[PDB]
Write a protein that binds this ligand. Structure first.
Ligand SMILES: CO[C@H]1[C@H]([C@@]2(C)O[C@@H]2CC=C(C)C)[C@](C)(O)CC[C@H]1OC(=O)NC(=O)CCl
Ligand SMILES: [Co+2]
Ligand SMILES: [Co+2]
Ligand code: NA
Length: 304
């Protein structure tokens, strides 16, 4: 394998962390290949759940808890901390809130969150590498509580970063918020990619194509499929009670991605940096509820 950049995996990984049996587990947790029966049984549909009041409550709860866990991780971002150390703290924080870390054994994914550094686009595997001054790192938190998943991520600065990092991360956040600001009943899912790419391109950045936002609730990913690039073919129309993510991945260079031999880590083919932000959203009649929002600050962590 030829690496696309400077980053390398730092093995071995610490042994898999167990989750006490009293925490309720999603179906894939105990599947030998981490496949999800319940996702399989809805594999290939494009019908979008309209959430019940019970569902809405379940999604508010897990999404609030997911935010608390991201906030734990955010508190640890500094030079010298390894992504495995972050993942360990995330693992314990999920358990402390009676949640299962959704990534863990999802299709045999080995860790309890995704940590994506620099040229990693998404799905980086926490490992023994200490963060370096100048890095950018995304932590993507998914929790499972009482049958529901919630999903968010932020990109963070590790110490002082260069002007390119500041611009990439600011622009990515702007793309997310512009997309969120358009969400409301009657809007086509395919429209969000138009808004995102327009802002990305205006700032000299490209938009990852191979990864999309997604429905989420009792399934970790389901309809709708939500591309972040212009003139996509996404199917469907937003309706009150829809819940899905918007999670744009923006790149300094080209949009092309490839996967490491680990089968998870997605990287820019050119080795240039990529940043991401994600919220889980619930479509309401005036617009949407940002289920994963910060409650105690107006702004994401990187603006500190
Ligand atoms: C819809 O899939 C999702 C993908 C997904 C759920 O498959 C991932 C498995 C999740 C973990 C935490 C390991 C991610 C990681 O959420 C990125 C965006 C999207 O990526 C693609 O659209 N592809
Ligand atoms: Co997501
Ligand atoms: Co996510
Ligand atoms: Na990155």
């Amino acid at each position: 394998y030829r690496y696309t950049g400077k980053l390398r995996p730092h093995y071995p990984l610490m042994p898999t962390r167990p989750v006490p049996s009293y925490i309720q587990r999603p179906d894939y947790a105990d599947h030998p290949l981490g496949m999800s029966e319940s996702e399989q049984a809805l594999k290939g549909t494009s019908q979008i759940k309209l959430l019940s009041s019970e569902d809405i409550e379940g999604m508010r709860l897990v999404c609030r808890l997911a935010r608390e866990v991201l906030d734990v991780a955010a508190g640890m971002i500094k030079p010298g901390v390894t992504t495995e150390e972050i993942d360990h703290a995330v693992h314990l924080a999920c358990i402390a809130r009676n949640c299962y870390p959704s990534p863990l054994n999802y299709y045999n994914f080995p860790k309890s969150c995704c940590t994506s550094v620099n040229e990693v686009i998404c799905h980086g595997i926490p490992d023994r590498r200490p963060l370096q001054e100048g890095d950018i790192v995304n932590v993507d938190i998914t929790l499972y509580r009482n049958g529901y998943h919630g999903d968010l991520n932020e990109t963070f600065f590790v110490g002082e970063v260069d002007d390119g990092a500041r611009k990439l991360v600011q622009t990515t956040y702007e793309c997310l918020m512009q997309a969120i600001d358009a969400v409301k009943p009657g809007v086509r899912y395919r429209e969000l990619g138009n808004i995102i790419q327009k802002h990305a391109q205006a700032n000299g950045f490209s938009v990852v194509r191979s990864y999309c936002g997604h429905g989420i609730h009792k399934l970790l990913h389901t309809a709708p499929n939500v591309p972040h690039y212009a003139k996509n073919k996404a199917v469907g129309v937003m309706k009150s009670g829809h819940v899905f993510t918007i999670e744009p991945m923006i790149c300094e260079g080209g949009w092309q991605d490839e996967t490491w031999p680990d089968g998870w880590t997605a990287v820019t083919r050119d080795g240039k940096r990529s940043a991401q932000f994600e919220h889980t959203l619930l479509v309401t009649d005036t617009g949407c509820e940002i289920l994963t929002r910060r409650l105690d600050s107006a702004r994401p962590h990187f603006m500190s």
